[PDB]
Design a protein around this ligand. Structure first.
Ligand SMILES: COc1ccc(C[NH3+])cc1O
Lengths: 351, 14
């Protein structure tokens, strides 16, 4: 076979240890999920906007009492107007307050006022993978593989808890002071036992079954991993067009072309992740995540060493001190106005 | 190969 006796026994034992880990992780998650206003706005100085979206922004803030820096996501309650926008915001807070994994951002506080919802997370100063990737062009395969391995382990963890992530992309992956990944933005994450039906995500990263309005499962995350690995290694994603409608047509076609510099091992992995037929997509078969972890492209990956953060990272972001924002792009700054009248109080009672 | 090079916004219901 491909493995000798010693290698096969080591791999098997490793897989049983994964099961043991995930069983304990589920017990810990459920405790926080079943039995979870830990601060207020004037406890922080607002420093700089780190990113912006349709419903709000993320700001670097400094806790007045302790001097610790944090990333504060601010959502305008009125802007959270559409039905699925509201439910998704409750998903995000509840999931972040219950998960625990080395590559998932840690939530520290959450609260709300008359106008906004707030989630205060650890500040990850190394910037988004997105801007490093756009600046360098593309990552070499070993560099892309180091990041991909962290996503594989993170999705193995999330999916074991029946959590789908649903917004993988370089914009949502921050690089920490040791060069490892922190997944942020859980706005589209959801606990799903089987199928779900919401049309959501980012166009370039949508699996065909989402676009086709089919009920779908956690395999959409494995498709998105294929898109991410391709984009990291090529510098652009596999389904690339100026308008969403054209992107969708490419995704559903079932056709992918690869740069001539992609290794054959990489192309094989990507053909099995970017698989329109769900009965054939890696991550969705009887062997689950192990079809990915045991693929030849990952043969050099020490999964436990990655989890334990023992592997030397390919890139360490420069940091000039606490509160440094040099690894983030600049954004238009807008005052945080809080109305004297409570908005949407009933819609956000649970937050 | 024309496509979107800037930050990409997620879509909520379409
Ligand atoms: C720690 O959380 C965040 C930090 C930075 C961004 C911008 N990419 C979004 C976040 O949700």
């Amino acid at each position: 076979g491909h493995m000798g006796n010693a290698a096969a026994a080591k791999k098997g034992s490793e897989q049983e240890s994964v099961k043991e880990f995930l069983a304990k992780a589920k017990e810990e998650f459920l405790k926080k999920w079943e039995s979870p206003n830990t601060a207020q706005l004037d406890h922080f100085d607002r420093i700089k906007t780190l990113g912006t979206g349709s419903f709000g922004r993320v700001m670097l803030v400094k806790h007045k009492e302790t001097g610790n820096h944090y990333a504060m996501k601010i959502l305008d309650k009125q802007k959270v107007v559409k039905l699925k926008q509201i439910e998704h915001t409750l998903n995000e807070k509840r999931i972040l307050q219950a998960v625990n994994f080395p590559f998932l951002v840690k939530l520290e506080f959450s609260f709300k006022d008359n106008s906004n919802l707030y989630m205060v997370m650890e500040y990850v100063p190394g910037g988004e993978m997105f801007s490093h990737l756009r600046r360098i062009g593309r990552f070499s395969e070993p560099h892309a593989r180091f990041y991909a391995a962290q996503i594989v382990l993170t999705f193995e963890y999330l999916h074991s808890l029946d959590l789908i992530y649903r917004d993988l992309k370089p914009e949502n992956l921050l690089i920490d002071q040791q060069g490892y990944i922190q997944v942020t933005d859980f706005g589209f994450a959801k606990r799903v036992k089987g199928r779900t039906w919401t049309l959501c995500g980012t166009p370039e990263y949508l699996a065909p079954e989402i676009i086709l309005s089919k009920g779908y499962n956690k395999a959409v995350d494995w498709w998105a991993l294929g898109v991410l690995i391709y984009e990291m290694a090529a510098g652009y994603p596999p389904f690339f067009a100026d308008q969403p409608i054209q992107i969708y047509e490419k995704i559903v076609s079932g056709k992918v072309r690869f740069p001539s510099h992609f290794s054959s091992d990489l192309k094989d992995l990507l053909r099995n992740l970017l698989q329109v037929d769900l009965t054939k997509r890696f991550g969705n078969l009887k062997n689950g995540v192990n079809d990915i972890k045991n693929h030849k492209w990952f043969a050099t990956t020490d999964w436990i060493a990655i989890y334990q953060r023992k592997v030397e990272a390919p890139f360490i972001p420069k940091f000039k001190g606490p509160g440094d924002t040099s690894n983030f792009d600049d954004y238009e700054e807008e005052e945080i106005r809080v109305s004297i009248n409570e908005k949407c109080g009933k819609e956000f009672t649970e937050f | 190969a024309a496509g979107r090079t800037g930050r990409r916004q997620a879509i909520h219901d379409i």
